[PDB]
Amino acid sequence: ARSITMQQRIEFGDCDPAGIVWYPNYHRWLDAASRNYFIKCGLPPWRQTVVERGIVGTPIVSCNASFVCTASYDDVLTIETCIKEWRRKSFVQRHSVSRTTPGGDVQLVMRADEIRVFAMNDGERLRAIEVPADYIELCS
Amino acid sequence: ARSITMQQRIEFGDCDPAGIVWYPNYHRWLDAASRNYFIKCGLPPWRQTVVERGIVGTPIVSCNASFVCTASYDDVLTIETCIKEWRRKSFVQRHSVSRTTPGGDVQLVMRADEIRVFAMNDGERLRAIEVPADYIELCS
Amino acid sequence: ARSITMQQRIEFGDCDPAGIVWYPNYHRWLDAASRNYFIKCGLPPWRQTVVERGIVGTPIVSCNASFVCTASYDDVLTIETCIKEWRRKSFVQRHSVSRTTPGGDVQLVMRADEIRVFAMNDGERLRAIEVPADYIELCS
Amino acid sequence: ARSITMQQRIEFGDCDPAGIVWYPNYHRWLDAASRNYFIKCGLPPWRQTVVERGIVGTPIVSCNASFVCTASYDDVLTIETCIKEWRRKSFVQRHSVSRTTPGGDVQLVMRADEIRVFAMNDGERLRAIEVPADYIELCS
Ligand SMILES: CC(C)(COP(=O)(O)OP(=O)(O)OC[C@H]1O[C@@H](n2cnc3c(N)ncnc32)[C@H](O)[C@@H]1OP(=O)(O)O)[C@@H](O)C(=O)NCCC(=O)NCCSCC(=O)c1ccc(O)cc1
Numbered sequence: 195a196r197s198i199t200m201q202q203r204i205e206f207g208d209c210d211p212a213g214i215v216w217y218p219n220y221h222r223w224l225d226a227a228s229r230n231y232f233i234k235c236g237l238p239p240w241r242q243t244v245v246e247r248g249i250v251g252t253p254i255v256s257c258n259a260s261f262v263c264t265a266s267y268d269d270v271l272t273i274e275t276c277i278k279e280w281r282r283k284s285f286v287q288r289h290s291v292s293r294t295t296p297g298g299d300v301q302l303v304m305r306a307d308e309i310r311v312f313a314m315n316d317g318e319r320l321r322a323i324e325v326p327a328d329y330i331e332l333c334s
Numbered sequence: 335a336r337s338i339t340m341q342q343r344i345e346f347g348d349c350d351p352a353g354i355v356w357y358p359n360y361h362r363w364l365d366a367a368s369r370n371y372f373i374k375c376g377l378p379p380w381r382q383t384v385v386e387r388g389i390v391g392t393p394i395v396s397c398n399a400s401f402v403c404t405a406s407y408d409d410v411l412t413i414e415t416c417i418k419e420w421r422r423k424s425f426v427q428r429h430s431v432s433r434t435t436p437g438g439d440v441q442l443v444m445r446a447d448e449i450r451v452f453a454m455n456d457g458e459r460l461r462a463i464e465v466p467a468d469y470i471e472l473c474s
Numbered sequence: 475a476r477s478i479t480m481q482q483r484i485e486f487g488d489c490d491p492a493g494i495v496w497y498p499n500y501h502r503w504l505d506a507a508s509r510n511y512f513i514k515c516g517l518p519p520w521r522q523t524v525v526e527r528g529i530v531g532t533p534i535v536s537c538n539a540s541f542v543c544t545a546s547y548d549d550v551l552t553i554e555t556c557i558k559e560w561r562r563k564s565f566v567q568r569h570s571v572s573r574t575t576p577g578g579d580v581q582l583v584m585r586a587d588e589i590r591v592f593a594m595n596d597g598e599r600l601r602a603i604e605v606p607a608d609y610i611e612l613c614s
Numbered sequence: 615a616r617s618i619t620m621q622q623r624i625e626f627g628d629c630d631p632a633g634i635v636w637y638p639n640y641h642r643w644l645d646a647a648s649r650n651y652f653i654k655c656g657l658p659p660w661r662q663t664v665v666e667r668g669i670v671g672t673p674i675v676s677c678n679a680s681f682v683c684t685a686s687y688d689d690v691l692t693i694e695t696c697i698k699e700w701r702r703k704s705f706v707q708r709h710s711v712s713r714t715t716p717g718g719d720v721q722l723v724m725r726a727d728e729i730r731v732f733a734m735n736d737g738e739r740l741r742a743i744e745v746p747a748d749y750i751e752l753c754s
């Protein structure tokens with residue numbers, strides 16, 4: 195499937211007392227990579243979609259993640275994101291995070307399969323919508 | 335199993351432009367609840383265990399999370415944490431996050447099953463260890 | 475002046491590789507204490523004020539902070555917040571952060587004087603407003 | 615003085631319910647720009663300096679910041695960092711954050727003068743040291 199890649203440098207503050215990336219940081223990066231995928235695919239920013247069609251973004255409903263090896267500040271991560279499956283109102287977005295050894299060897303760092311949905315805010319109530327056909331086309 | 339509960343107030347800054355908790359924040363809270371469980375169970379802080387026995391903490395190796403309903407600033411979350419299963423070097427730590435409606439009704443917000451391990455830092459290399467028997471006893 | 479106090483526990487993830495609170499975390503806490511002051515003083519949540527009168531919150535325009543001593547996970551901080559001065563469209567909000575030694579001795583950890591304003595979002599443009607008289611009264 | 619520049623893209627999660635960058639995020643970026651300055655100037659990473667000479671990094675002792683205009687997700691910030699003054703054990707590190715209008719016009723977003731020190735961890739006690747002469751030379 196159509197894959198988008200992005201890089202992410204790890205900062206000192208992104209690490210814990212144990213000297214490695216504090217895990218919630220990976221989710222911050224996964225969230226940026228998720229949105230980056232759609233922006234690169236041609237969708238407008240949520241600020242615009244909300245005005246146009248009520249779409250506030252793609253909130254997450256489920257996640258399955260695995261942490262394979264550690265990473266630390268100064269490491270440059272490479273994130274590869276694709277849509278694994280289009281369902282009805284949901285979609286599975288896969289992210290593979292790697293880093294390179296000075297050997298030119300690519301090591302898998304972590305991976306996550308996120309299940310998200312396009313949604314609208316009906317007043318205070320979040321509500322999922324069927325995946326827009328036009329969006330599927332842009333992402334194909 | 336032995337369950338520990340803790341509360342967490344959601345702050346304005348913990349929310350996104352869509353006005354609800356930005357997901358990585360739940361993982362920050364899950365991480366605090368994970369450690370809180372061990373502290374409440376009687377283990378010493380990692381600062382001390384590292385000196386004593388080399389244990390740096392309990393890094394995460396895998397996670398399965400589901401987001402059931404939204405939450406926003408001023409909501410007070412209740413997190414319930416327990417150890418679901420002791421394996422060899424790993425353990426499954428379950429966290430249930432809820433909030434209360436003014437109806438006195440308890441709504442499930444999110445849940446996560448985290449797989450972690452007790453580990454040591456051998457120089458720059460993180461390494462898992464068999465779950466310490468003494469720790470299993472404190473947590474029982 | 476009217477002072478509001480709140481507590482904040484420091485978490486493992488709130489610390490850096492150097493084992494102490496990573497500074498941006500203090501600002502997260504200062505922001506929560508700022509809002510907590512207004513909530514405790516009786517103002518409604520911004521979600522409501524925006525609908526009622528267009529007020530989105532109190533964005534920061536300036537800050538002067540000093541870090542006196544370190545803090546780490548498990549330390550319980552005590553934050554004291556007050557309004558130091560009401561200007562025209564701005565106000566100076568002071569925050570004093572301390573922690574206690576087991577000696578019953580209170581140590582100053584950090585302090586910050588924040589300059590904020592009540593504001594509205596005119597479309598995409600943030601705009602400060604004269605401090606509402608009713609708010610000054612609630613905070614007095 | 616020797617100035618180092620770096621870019622920073624603002625993400626959806628870096629914004630608050632008011633749709634603009636939540637302030638503590640600027641400090642995260644200022645901290646990365648501070649370290650980036652030293653790395654670019656040729657100092658080794660703190661992981662190495664701590665082993666070699668005990669230097670854990672450059673903790674902050676004071677800060678004076680001003681927020682000039684707002685920024686939001688997708689905006690690309692440009693951060694310019696330099697050392698404004700070398701004192702004895704401390705130094706003043708200035709950071710100027712800007713963004714560009716599609717007009718090719720550069721708008722100042724925020725600025726901060728941070729006062730930091732090179733330090734060591736003597737056991738649990740952080741301690742400032744006289745600025746290393748060799749470091750001053752690398753940064754010149
Ligand atoms: C999102 C929603 C309102 C959807 O509920 P709904 O309108 O009643 O519709 P429905 O239940 O049919 O769910 C829609 C789809 O999700 C699927 N789904 C929902 N939960 C799950 C799950 N646990 N596992 C698998 N699929 C799921 C569901 O099966 C359906 O898929 P499909 O069969 O149509 O293909 C409800 O699940 C909910 O509120 N969950 C909480 C969402 C939440 O708070 N997530 C955490 C914070 S989100 C804030 C955030 O970080 C963010 C980031 C980026 C961005 O662009 C926007 C937000």
Ligand SMILES: CC(C)(COP(=O)(O)OP(=O)(O)OC[C@H]1O[C@@H](n2cnc3c(N)ncnc32)[C@H](O)[C@@H]1OP(=O)(O)O)[C@@H](O)C(=O)NCCC(=O)NCCSCC(=O)c1ccc(O)cc1
Nearest residue numbers: 216217261262263264391392393395396421422423424462
């Ligand atoms: C942790 C480790 C070094 C373990 O590798 P190892 O020493 O070679 O040993 P091993 O592979 O046998 O794994 C140990 C156990 O984990 C189990 N395990 C590992 N991966 C998985 C997985 N994906 N699913 C299920 N079980 C798993 C494995 O089966 C074994 O369990 P058991 O059968 O003995 O009961 C390696 O998996 C690794 O480095 N993963 C990356 C860890 C990481 O970077 N996590 C994200 C950041 S952690 C920083 C953090 O946020 C933190 C928070 C709190 C705290 O207290 C400490 C840190």
Ligand SMILES: CC(C)(COP(=O)(O)OP(=O)(O)OC[C@H]1O[C@@H](n2cnc3c(N)ncnc32)[C@H](O)[C@@H]1OP(=O)(O)O)[C@@H](O)C(=O)NCCC(=O)NCCSCC(=O)c1ccc(O)cc1
Nearest residue numbers: 531532533535536561562563564602636637681682683684
């Ligand atoms: C806020 C504003 C639109 C105000 O501009 P304005 O409408 O043209 O009005 P004006 O310039 O007269 O400023 C209003 C007042 O601020 C005072 N002020 C502004 N800058 C300064 C400064 N550097 N030092 C001292 N006073 C200042 C100004 O003198 C006046 O005070 P007063 O004499 O009326 O008492 C403009 O300064 C601006 O956009 N600054 C950037 C704001 C920003 O992006 N802050 C960082 C992110 S804010 C997101 C956030 O974290 C947040 C947290 C909590 C919350 O409830 C809301 C948001």
Ligand SMILES: CC(C)(COP(=O)(O)OP(=O)(O)OC[C@H]1O[C@@H](n2cnc3c(N)ncnc32)[C@H](O)[C@@H]1OP(=O)(O)O)[C@@H](O)C(=O)NCCC(=O)NCCSCC(=O)c1ccc(O)cc1
Nearest residue numbers: 496497541542543544671672673675676701702703704742
């Ligand atoms: C840092 C220190 C131990 C220094 O105390 P000290 O060893 O007794 O020495 P001393 O008081 O003489 O201070 C050293 C210098 O700082 C100057 N200084 C200290 N406070 C101030 C202040 N408020 N305003 C101006 N200058 C100041 C002081 O005048 C002297 O400068 P100089 O005249 O020698 O040029 C003490 O001030 C302290 O613990 N402050 C708290 C530090 C803290 O917790 N900061 C917040 C978290 S730091 C965690 C972090 O985010 C981080 C980020 C990056 C990195 O690489 C490392 C850490």
